Amino acid sequence: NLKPVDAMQCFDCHTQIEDMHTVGKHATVNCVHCHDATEHVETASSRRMGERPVTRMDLEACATCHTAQFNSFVEVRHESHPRLEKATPTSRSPMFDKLIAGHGFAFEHAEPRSHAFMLVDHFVVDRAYGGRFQFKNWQKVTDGMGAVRGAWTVLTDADPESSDQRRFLSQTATAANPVCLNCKTQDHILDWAYMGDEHEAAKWSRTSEVVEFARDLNHPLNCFMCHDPHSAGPRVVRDGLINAVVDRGLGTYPHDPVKSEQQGMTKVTFQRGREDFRAIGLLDTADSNVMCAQCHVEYNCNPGYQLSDGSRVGMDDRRANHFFWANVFDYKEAAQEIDFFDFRHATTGAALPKLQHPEAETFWGSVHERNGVACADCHMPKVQLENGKVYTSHSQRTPRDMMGQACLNCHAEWTEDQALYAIDYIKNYTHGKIVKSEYWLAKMIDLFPVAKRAGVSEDVLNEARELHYDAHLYWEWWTAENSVGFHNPDQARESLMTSISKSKEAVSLLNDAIDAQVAS
Amino acid sequence: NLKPVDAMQCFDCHTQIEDMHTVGKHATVNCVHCHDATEHVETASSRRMGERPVTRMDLEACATCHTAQFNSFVEVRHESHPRLEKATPTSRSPMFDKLIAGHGFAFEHAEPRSHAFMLVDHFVVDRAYGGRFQFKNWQKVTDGMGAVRGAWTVLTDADPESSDQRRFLSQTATAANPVCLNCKTQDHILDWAYMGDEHEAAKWSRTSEVVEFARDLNHPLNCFMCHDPHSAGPRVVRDGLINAVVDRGLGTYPHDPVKSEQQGMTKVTFQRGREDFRAIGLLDTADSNVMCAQCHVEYNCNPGYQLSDGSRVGMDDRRANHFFWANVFDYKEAAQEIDFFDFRHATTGAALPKLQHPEAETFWGSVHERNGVACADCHMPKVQLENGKVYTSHSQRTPRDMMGQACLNCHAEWTEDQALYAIDYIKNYTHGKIVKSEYWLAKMIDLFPVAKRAGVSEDVLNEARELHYDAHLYWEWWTAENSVGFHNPDQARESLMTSISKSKEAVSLLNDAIDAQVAS
Amino acid sequence: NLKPVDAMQCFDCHTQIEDMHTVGKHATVNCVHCHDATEHVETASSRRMGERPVTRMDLEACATCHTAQFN
Amino acid sequence: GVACADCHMPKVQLENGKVYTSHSQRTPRDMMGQACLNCHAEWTEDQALYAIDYIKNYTHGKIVKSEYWLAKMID
Ligand code: HEC
Ligand code: HEC
Ligand code: HEC
Ligand code: HEC
Ligand code: HEC
Ligand code: HEC
Ligand code: HEC
Ligand code: HEC
Ligand code: HEC
Ligand code: HEC
Ligand code: HEC
Ligand code: HEC
Ligand code: HEC
Ligand code: HEC
Ligand SMILES: [Ca+2]
Ligand SMILES: [Ca+2]
């Protein structure tokens, strides 16, 4: 059984913790619930850590007093089909292989599934670690509780004796790097300096051997990613988000200065040896839009190249951990502002961006966002009980599973079937335009080899490559974004029509240039 | 409250109405239910209208005394997925964009949904009005009753101050013209001369500004499209159908003279200033096959070109409002008979037809049609009540929703699952041949640029273009037709195999010609 | 099929019904829906019924225009 | 101001249609959405049924006891 420790002794050296813990709703929660600091207290000074205390990062540290929230979190939605590749005719991007050729995502890009699996899924996807990690067997894919207990309870490593990123199977890639893990776990929260910069107190950084880092990480989506463990108040911990919102002054709602002020973020920095080390962002309100934006954003978390001169941008560069914090129509400017692109298309040679799940940036300016609705209202609502103490569901999932609570309480004019019909109208329309955009991108891409072989000039090919960047951006945003337009239907429509327009311009340019070469 | 008017006063000048009203089952229904004619009666003469009476065209004019039929009509089938683009891998025509390139349908062609939405869907589809009209917001897509009350109660116009057809968004088209509206509404029944010819008494015609016309129209599928309001007897009002059946003498069942005589149509013409103005077709029997054929047919409702010389055929030409009234194997001859084609393929340059929803012509000669079965038996059956007055369901929808009434009463040997299995056998087989036909069409189409660039002769290209017409026709009939072969499975099979044969002939011709150029 | 009768003629002797029928939502509903009064009209005066007209009491007399309520 | 029809012949609720008054005069148990929960938004169907049953059960118990005592007197 746990035995409490004297917090006042800790507070002597930990003023920031005292100021947070004594005021919030964890003022009665003893440190022993999460820390084993006996040897630390014996050896520390006011400025030197001495022996390092043990800090629990397992979600069960919270389950003890918050079982309802933990159990709701760890539930597996079996209807969220697992390991479902998006580059298939029946999923989100039928022509993805042709369009993304040159990028690691060609090796595998599955639809998301329940949060419990995020860290294990990161480890086992074919694009990440060369197939090094696997579930212990194919049965273990069901085990959400086991994944939560720890990745290494359910996974195996093909070669514990080496730590290099390499292929273990032919059709894999080694795209993973340390930055990725910030959106899968925060087990490393005390071992990683802000932004993953090099730091004498950091075990891990952007430039670490990712296989070694991986082995040190266990738990998905720690509860403390959204809730300060000391004050119990709302927060974010993701460095890239704090950097966008606070350091770069863009605000929590870049398009709305007032809402940004009302629903803001305060950066709190913790030091090691009186040098800034790590930071958190305390939220003015329990604003799920910003909490979920720790991960459900478009980002850089990878090496790339400069738009200006084509030179390599490696993991050592700050740009390798970056939140663009820009909607689809501001993205090109945001990529220009850091002089960055992700890859060269394998067929066209165009410099292209790689877009990833920009739900937060897409939601900005939508009718729901403008009306004060937030992700949690649709994806983790309060639970309705005939007789019971209400709590917030932590099963982050489609509203289709809880339409009473997610939609119909605010849309009293609709039945469940009507609300579902409205969702489907948007998704069906948007998906149709995604497919049309892919058709036209594919048509353009297929002309590049024909044009090169016909002797079309590099000047013309480069004009087409410039169009490819835009045709790509204004399409891929929407295969990346998980709502199939629901989050911002008018924006999706405008963007996808722009993609098609750009591809059609490139097709005409290339066809005319090929025909002129042939005629000559 | 309504106050009756003296019908005998009207009958003094309206002999045709007297002859219909006094004999049928509306003999006791006073004119005030549908007409406000006070000032008209004061000012008319036997030959001049004077002040124009108001005529109600809203469906609620009938709902008052026929609520069951109205409510069944306006029901929305939420399982009929809305705004679902057909040019996607999971819908009816995976390769539609490549095959239809050059035609407006490339901008958008969705699956049908419930009848309540026909007029609003016509107004808002991306191919029709350049994106000028939209629902007031994305919520309104659910509102079938509102659509029925009137399109302009649920839609907005991007520019009320102009009336030209233009693009408001990039990836739209302006294919709509006045003829289209005849299959969406008959609000214009008193304002449109037969066939849309120019007429001094007609406000609207084939050559009208369609945006202005659109603004004057409100209600979908008026109840009086199938039921004469004066006699209550069965009829059609669609000019193009009357023209095919009566003027051109083709009959209600062109393949069956006897059934045509037993189940015929009598053209009744109404005059303005003692000049023929409009017409209806009174049916000998309540024959849903002919009622539904007002709209569920292949038609011209658009400009096009002549097969003979390639010249433009505009909206002013009668051929712009035409029912071919021909099955798939008689269609080419029917298009030749009016010297007409719809578009030139964007890649192949072939003159091609555009086929649209030919359910009526497909049903001819099928086993069910030959056995006296009609559309209503499967799509709007009598309602079965343990205790109640029977009425006819007006919810025109798939029999899957009412298999007891639609199929199993006539197929006592089957369970519901067996009947569904039989439908699926046909649809699955037919769809497979549609996909194969598209594969071969696509293969042929892709050879055209290769052949042109290799220097293949125009003579060879023109031979391939002639094959393209047939390959196209014998495929597109079946993506246009909504039953996926169920209405006439053997015909679908024969046609689709013909399509593949034609495409294979073209592929061989082009490949051999390319190879010969290369060899030279 | 029903053939309407001249309600104004009935009202020459039926002021009580006139005052109800002409004001309410059945003002357009002809008497033939519920009465067979041909021989009555031929034989009545304002003070003598003559032949008794038939009045329908069956619910189907209403179902004809109000099927939803009937069913 | 509630009347028999509110519980026993309510207006029909239609996603798309012309409203009319149900003439099926029957227990509200068959149409609880339209003939109780429309007024009692604080309740689920099961809660509303439970409240009916509490009353009927209590009342019936007193009917049975009343009959017991009447019968004892009669005898
Ligand atoms: C003699 C002063 C002193 C006392 C007493 C003390 N600490 Fe610390 N502690 C430090 C210093 C110094 C650091 C390094 C960070 C800093 O400079 O604030 C540290 C770091 C930590 C960390 C971060 C460890 C890591 O992995 O980065 C935790 C957790 C912690 N202390 C918990 C506690 C707890 C719980 C108590 C009471 C049981 C306690 N400390 C008492 C001085 C103290
Ligand atoms: C020893 C029991 C205990 C432990 C362990 C514990 N909590 Fe709490 N927590 C509480 C109590 C007590 C409250 C206050 C309840 C109230 O008054 O509403 C609370 C409140 C909260 C609140 C609501 C705060 C607010 O201001 O509304 C959050 C969020 C929370 N805890 C999260 C967590 C997280 C995350 C963990 C794991 C890092 C955790 N708790 C661990 C007991 C515990
Ligand atoms: C009568 C025994 C038996 C039956 C029947 C059976 N399983 Fe298994 N299954 C096993 C055993 C034993 C293993 C291997 C256990 C281990 O090594 O951990 C296994 C392994 C598996 C695996 C892992 C496969 C792999 O390659 O790693 C899956 C998935 C699985 N079973 C699913 C199913 C499914 C689904 C069914 C029903 C279609 C089924 N099993 C029926 C006994 C059975
Ligand atoms: C800014 C936070 C963020 C970063 C950094 C991040 N991800 Fe993710 N990842 C997500 C979110 C959100 C999802 C779920 C939504 C989705 O997949 O579209 C996800 C899903 C996944 C999945 C499951 C779906 C799939 O694509 O197969 C895998 C595997 C994955 N990430 C791997 C990685 C890898 C490898 C990296 C680093 C190269 C990485 N992630 C970096 C946020 C992030
Ligand atoms: C992605 C951010 C996020 C994560 C991670 C998270 N929560 Fe929450 N949590 C929320 C939100 C949002 C609320 C509701 C705040 C509101 O509306 O006031 C909430 C509320 C709570 C509350 C307050 C009582 C309630 O139910 O409303 C507790 C306790 C809590 N969470 C515990 C946990 C536990 C334990 C975990 C880990 C199993 C967890 N949270 C993980 C977002 C998160
Ligand atoms: C007004 C309600 C609403 C809001 C607010 C909302 N979403 Fe969604 N979201 C939806 C709907 C509807 C879908 C489509 C779900 C479906 O079709 O099953 C969706 C889909 C998703 C999906 C994919 C779910 C799946 O299983 O396919 C993710 C991830 C997501 N949203 C994240 C977010 C984020 C993060 C936010 C806050 C920035 C957000 N959503 C805000 C309604 C909402
Ligand atoms: C707590 C409020 C709230 C919630 C939760 C909510 N809605 Fe809404 N929704 C609104 C409001 C307010 C509007 C805008 C109303 C208006 O302007 O007419 C709106 C707009 C919409 C629109 C129109 C969008 C557009 O771009 O025109 C759709 C569709 C919709 N909601 C569906 C849903 C669905 C489905 C859900 C459940 C996933 C949901 N809403 C949840 C309040 C809500
Ligand atoms: C003095 C003769 C006269 C009388 C009486 C008369 N009409 Fe007409 N009405 C006409 C003429 C003439 C036209 C033009 C068409 C025609 O020539 O038949 C016309 C046209 C109409 C139209 C078509 C209007 C349009 O928009 O095209 C309607 C409806 C109509 N009458 C209804 C009635 C009704 C109902 C009454 C009795 C209340 C009535 N009329 C009495 C002469 C008459
Ligand atoms: C004032 C009430 C009233 C109005 C308004 C009305 N009807 Fe009727 N309708 C009747 C009556 C009464 C009958 C005869 C019922 C019977 O005897 O079977 C009838 C019969 C019919 C029939 C059956 C005819 C047959 O020969 O079998 C049809 C079809 C019909 N109406 C359609 C309509 C249409 C369409 C409208 C709107 C243009 C309409 N009705 C408006 C009262 C009305
Ligand atoms: C001969 C009658 C007829 C004509 C004329 C007609 N349609 Fe249709 N329309 C139909 C039928 C029947 C359907 C439903 C069956 C289907 O879509 O296959 C339909 C469906 C539609 C739809 C919904 C499905 C889709 O394609 O997205 C739209 C939009 C539409 N029509 C627009 C038009 C336009 C624009 C015109 C004129 C260029 C037109 N229609 C002319 C009969 C017609
Ligand atoms: C597409 C043609 C069509 C349309 C439009 C149409 N009906 Fe019908 N209607 C039919 C058919 C078919 C029958 C059954 C005839 C038969 O089998 O005798 C029917 C029968 C009827 C009947 C006779 C009683 C019955 O139910 O059998 C009435 C009354 C009627 N319809 C009213 C209406 C009303 C009111 C509307 C507008 C809401 C409407 N109809 C629209 C085709 C149509
Ligand atoms: C013997 C029964 C039968 C007859 C008669 C019939 N159909 Fe069909 N129809 C079907 C079946 C079965 C389907 C496929 C429905 C499905 O798979 O859900 C279908 C599909 C349709 C569809 C598409 C429905 C949808 O939701 O996909 C339309 C439109 C249609 N038929 C119109 C007609 C027309 C118009 C007629 C008269 C010329 C007609 N049908 C006659 C059985 C019939
Ligand atoms: C506030 C709603 C309400 C009102 C108003 C109401 N009732 Fe009831 N009535 C009920 C309930 C509840 C029952 C018990 C039904 C059950 O248990 O299934 C009932 C039972 C009945 C029953 C027996 C039903 C059966 O199937 O056992 C009759 C008869 C009845 N009521 C008549 C009337 C009359 C007549 C009025 C108007 C003077 C009236 N009720 C007003 C709620 C109502
Ligand atoms: C026991 C009395 C009673 C009887 C008998 C009765 N109704 Fe009603 N009726 C009502 C009530 C109560 C209303 C609703 C009045 C209101 O709330 O405004 C109603 C309304 C109506 C309405 C108006 C439209 C509507 O639905 O609200 C019509 C039409 C009607 N009844 C027809 C009939 C028919 C036909 C019959 C015979 C089958 C019938 N009624 C028998 C009580 C009755
Ligand atoms: Ca990116
Ligand atoms: Ca056509």
Task: Count other C-beta atoms under 10 Å from residue B24's C-beta.
Answer: 17
Alpha helices in A267-372 (DSSP H): 288-292, 328-337, 359-363, 367-370
Angle at D28 between CA D26 and CA D32, to 5 degrees: 145
Q: Which chains touch C (3 or more CB pairs under 8 A)?
A: B, D
Task: Name the phi and psi angles at A80, rounded to 5.
Answer: -85, 95
d(CA D61, CA D70): 14
Which residue type does A235 have?
R
Task: Name the phi and psi angles at B248, rounded to 5.
Answer: -90, 0
d(CA B496, CA B127): 27
Give the residue from chain D lying closest to A414, CA to CA: D15
Mutate to test the interface with D, among C62, C69, C70, C71 (most CBs of D within 10 A): C69
d(CA A284, CA A262): 7
A374, A339 Cβ separation under 8 angstroms: no
| Inter-chain touch B110–A420, beta carbons under 8 Å | no
List of long-range contacts for B22-27, beta carbons under 8 Å, 24+ apart? B22/C3, B23/B231, B23/C1, B24/B228, B24/B230, B24/B231, B24/B232, B24/B233, B24/C1, B25/B231, B25/B232, B25/C1, B25/C2, B26/B229, B26/B230, B26/B231, B26/B232, B27/C1, B27/C2, B27/C3, B27/C4
Give the residue from chain B lying closest to D16, CA to CA: B145
d(CA A155, CA A166): 18
Q: What are the structure tokens assigned to B493, written together?
A: 């099979």
Residues at CB less than 6 angstroms from ligand 5: A 59, 62, 66, 69-70, 73, 221, 223, 225-227, 286, 288, 291-292, 376, 391-392, 394
> Which residues, including other chains, have CB under 8 Å from residue B192's CB and lie 6 or more apart?
B178, B182, B202, B203, B204, B205, B278
Q: Does the annotation place B394 within a ligand binding site?
A: yes
Q: Which residues pair with A300 in a beta bridge?
A: A322
| Inter-chain touch B71–D18, beta carbons under 8 Å | yes
Which residue type does A55 have?
T
- Residue A301 Cα to ligand 14 midpoint, Å, equals 69
Q: What are the structure tokens assigned to A346, written together?
A: 């394998």
d(CA B124, CA B134): 5
A427, A478 Cβ separation under 8 angstroms: no
d(CA B440, CA B450): 16
- D29 within ligand 13 shell (Cβ under 6 A): yes
- B441 within ligand 11 shell (Cβ under 6 A): no
List of long-range contacts for A368-377, beta carbons under 8 Å, 24+ apart? A368/A487, A369/A289, A373/A410, A374/A287, A374/A288, A374/A289, A375/A288, A375/A289, A375/A291, A375/A292, A375/A296, A376/A288, A376/A291, A376/A292, A377/A288, A377/A406, A377/A410
| Inter-chain touch B28–C24, beta carbons under 8 Å | no
Mutate to test the interface with D, among A384, A386, A413 (most CBs of D within 10 A): A386
State the closest ligand 14 atom to the C-alpha of D20, by its place in the atom list counted from 1: 26
Alpha helices in A341-415 (DSSP H): 359-363, 367-370, 375-379, 403
Distances in Å between the alpha carbon of B251 and those of B102, B276, B330?
A: 35, 22, 15
Distances in Å between the alpha carbon of B512 and those of A56, A453, B436?
A: 73, 22, 22
Give the residue from chain B lying closest to A498, CA to CA: B170
Name the strands in the sheet holding B265-272, side by side, starting at the edge strand that comes first in the sequence: B235-236, B275-283, B265-272
Distances in Å between the alpha carbon of B493 and those of B331, B398, B484?
A: 17, 22, 11
Decide: A and C in contact? Rule: 3+ Cβ pairs under 8 Å. no
d(CA B252, CA D54): 66
A513, A450 Cβ separation under 8 angstroms: no
Which residue type does B243 have?
N
CA distance D45 to chain C (A): 26
Closest C-alpha residue for ligand 2 atom 17: A25
Helix (H) or strand (E) holding C70: helix C67-70
d(CA B460, CA B510): 8
B472, B352 Cβ separation under 8 angstroms: yes
Helix (H) or strand (E) holding B297: none
Q: What are the structure tokens assigned to D15, written together?
A: 């996603």
Which residue type does B156 have?
T
Q: What is the CA radius of gyration of chain A?
A: 24
d(CA A107, CA A113): 18
**Helix, strand, or coil (residue A183):** helix
A314, A279 Cβ separation under 8 angstroms: no
| Inter-chain touch D16–B116, beta carbons under 8 Å | yes
Nearest Cα residue to A490 out of B32, B106, B138, B291: B138
Cα A56 off chain centre by: 24
d(CA A401, CA A416): 11
- Residue B503 Cα to ligand 12 midpoint, Å, equals 29
Task: Name the phi and psi angles at B64, rounded to 5.
Answer: -55, -40
**Judging by beta carbons within 10 Å of its beta carbon (0-12, 13-18, 19+), is residue A342 exposed, middle or buried?**
buried
Which residue type does A64 have?
T
- Residue A394 Cα to ligand 5 midpoint, Å, equals 7
d(CA A208, CA B430): 57
* Least distant ligand from the CA of B186: 11
B324, B331 Cβ separation under 8 angstroms: yes
* Least distant ligand from the CA of B368: 12
Beta strands A133-135 and B265-272 are unpaired
State the closest ligand 12 atom to the C-alpha of B377, by its place in the atom list counted from 1: 5
d(CA B196, CA B218): 19
Sign of CA dihedral A101, A107, A110, A116: negative
Nearest Cα residue to A155 out of A183, A198, A123, A192: A123
* Least distant ligand from the CA of A52: 1
A461, A452 Cβ separation under 8 angstroms: yes
Cα B426 off chain centre by: 24
Nearest Cα residue to B226 out of B278, B182, B291, B284: B291
A239, A269 Cβ separation under 8 angstroms: no
Angle between helix B458-480 and B416-454 (nearest 10): 160
> Which residues, including other chains, have CB under 8 Å from residue B311's CB and lie 6 or more apart?
B305
* Least distant ligand from the CA of B298: 16
Nearest Cα residue to A181 out of A229, A111, A121: A121
d(CA A296, CA A374): 13
Residues at CB less than 6 angstroms from ligand 4: A 109-110, 112, 121-122, 125, 128, 175-177, 179-180, 182-183, 295-297, 299, 301-302, 357, 482
Which residue type does A403 have?
M
Alpha helices in D1-75 (DSSP H): 4-8, 32, 45-74
Helix (H) or strand (E) holding B323: strand B322-323
Which residue type does B28 have?
T
- Residue B261 Cα to ligand 12 midpoint, Å, equals 25
d(CA A229, CA A24): 10
| Inter-chain touch D18–B67, beta carbons under 8 Å | yes
Supply the DSSP string of A473-519, one letter for each residue: HHHHHHHHSTTTTTTSHHHHHHHHHHHHHHHHHHHHHHHHHHHHHHH
d(CA B290, CA B300): 18
d(CA B357, CA D70): 78
Task: Name the phi and psi angles at B46, rounded to 5.
Answer: -60, -25
Supply the DSSP string of B46-73, one letter for each residue: SS---SPPEE--STHHHHTT-HHHHHHH
Task: Name the phi and psi angles at B60, rounded to 5.
Answer: -65, -20
In terms of phi and psi (left: phi > 0; alpha: psi -120 to 50; beta: otherwise), the region of C4 is beta
Q: Which chains touch A (3 or more CB pairs under 8 A)?
A: B, D
Size of interface C-D (CB pairs under 8 A): 5
Cα A213 off chain centre by: 18
Nearest Cα residue to A230 out of A27, A13, A59, A67: A27
Which residue type does A484 have?
V
Local structure of residue B243 (DSSP, 8 states): I
Helix (H) or strand (E) holding A120: helix A118-124
Size of interface B-C (CB pairs under 8 A): 54
In terms of phi and psi (left: phi > 0; alpha: psi -120 to 50; beta: otherwise), the region of A172 is beta
Cα B250 off chain centre by: 19
In terms of phi and psi (left: phi > 0; alpha: psi -120 to 50; beta: otherwise), the region of A142 is alpha
D31, D22 Cβ separation under 8 angstroms: yes
Distances in Å between the alpha carbon of B420 and those of A331, A518, B198, B401?
A: 50, 55, 49, 11
Give the residue from chain A lying closest to D46, CA to CA: A386
Closest C-alpha residue for ligand 5 atom 28: A69
Closest C-alpha residue for ligand 8 atom 16: B272
d(CA B362, CA B8): 46
Nearest Cα residue to B328 out of B302, B310, B353: B353
Task: Name the phi and psi angles at B192, rounded to 5.
Answer: -135, 120
| Inter-chain touch D16–B70, beta carbons under 8 Å | no
d(CA B279, CA B206): 16
- Residue A107 Cα to ligand 14 midpoint, Å, equals 68
Which residue type does B64 have?
T
d(CA B123, CA B106): 17
For residue D40, which residues of chain A lie inside 8 Å, CB to CB? none
- A189 within ligand 2 shell (Cβ under 6 A): no
B interface with A, Cβ–Cβ < 8 A, is 76, 78, 81-85, 87-90, 94, 97-98, 108, 110, 137-139, 141-142, 169-171, 449, 453
Residue with tokens 């996808």: A496
3-state secondary structure B353-421: CCCCCCHHHHHCCCHHHHCCCCHHHHHCCECCCCCCCCCECCCCCCHHHCHHHHHHCCCCCCCHHHHHH
Angle at B485 between CA B481 and CA B486, to 5 degrees: 110
B95, A95 Cβ separation under 8 angstroms: no
Task: Name the phi and psi angles at B114, rounded to 5.
Answer: -60, 150
Closest C-alpha residue for ligand 12 atom 34: B375
Angle at A221 between CA A218 and CA A222, to 5 degrees: 75
Distances in Å between the alpha carbon of B511 and those of A33, A447, B63, B454, B504?
A: 76, 20, 63, 11, 10
Q: What is the resolution of this structure in A?
A: 1.5
Nearest Cα residue to A331 out of A355, A313, A309: A355
Per-residue burial over A247-274, b = 16 or more CB atoms within 10 Å of its CB, e = otherwise: eeebbbbbebeebbeebbbeebeeebee
D33, B86 Cβ separation under 8 angstroms: no
**Length reported for chain A:** 520
| Inter-chain touch B28–C32, beta carbons under 8 Å | yes
d(CA A415, CA A125): 39
Residue with tokens 């738990």: A219
Supply the DSSP string of A299-328, one letter for each residue: EE-S-EE-TTT--EE-TTSGGGSEE----H
d(CA A442, CA A461): 16
Nearest CB among A94, A429, A497 relative to B170 is that of A497
Local structure of residue D71 (DSSP, 8 states): H
Angle at B406 between CA B400 and CA B411, to 5 degrees: 105
**Judging by beta carbons within 10 Å of its beta carbon (0-12, 13-18, 19+), is residue D60 exposed, middle or buried?**
exposed
Nearest Cα residue to B289 out of B361, B224, B383, B391: B361
Angle at A438 between CA A435 and CA A444, to 5 degrees: 150
Give the residue from chain A lying closest to B86, CA to CA: A432
Q: Does the annotation place A295 within a ligand binding site?
A: yes
CA distance A471 to chain B (A): 14
Nearest CB among D15, D46, D47 relative to A418 is that of D15
Domains located in chain A, CATH noted? 1-58 (1.10.287.3080), 59-413 (1.10.1130.10), 414-520 (1.20.140.10)
- Residue D54 Cα to ligand 13 midpoint, Å, equals 15
Nearest Cα residue to A353 out of A323, A332, A324, A322: A332
CA dihedral B500, B501, B507, B510 (to 10 degrees): -140
Q: Which chains touch B (3 or more CB pairs under 8 A)?
A: A, C, D
Angle between helix B416-454 and B489-519 (nearest 10): 20
Which residue type does B279 have?
A
> Which residues, including other chains, have CB under 8 Å from residue D62's CB and lie 6 or more apart?
none
3-state secondary structure B108-136: CCECCCCHHHHHHHHHHCCCCCCCCEEEC
Q: Which of B127, B184, B241, B398 to mutate to test the pocket of ligand 10 (most atoms within 8 A of CB)?
A: B184
A444, A510 Cβ separation under 8 angstroms: yes
Closest C-alpha residue for ligand 12 atom 13: B483
Mutate to test the interface with C, among B8, B10, B28 (most CBs of C within 10 A): B28
Supply the DSSP string of B127-169, one letter for each residue: TTSTT-EEESSGGGGG-HHHHHH-GGGTEEES-TT--S---SS
Q: Which residues pair with B271 in a beta bridge?
A: B276
Residue with tokens 């005529």: B55
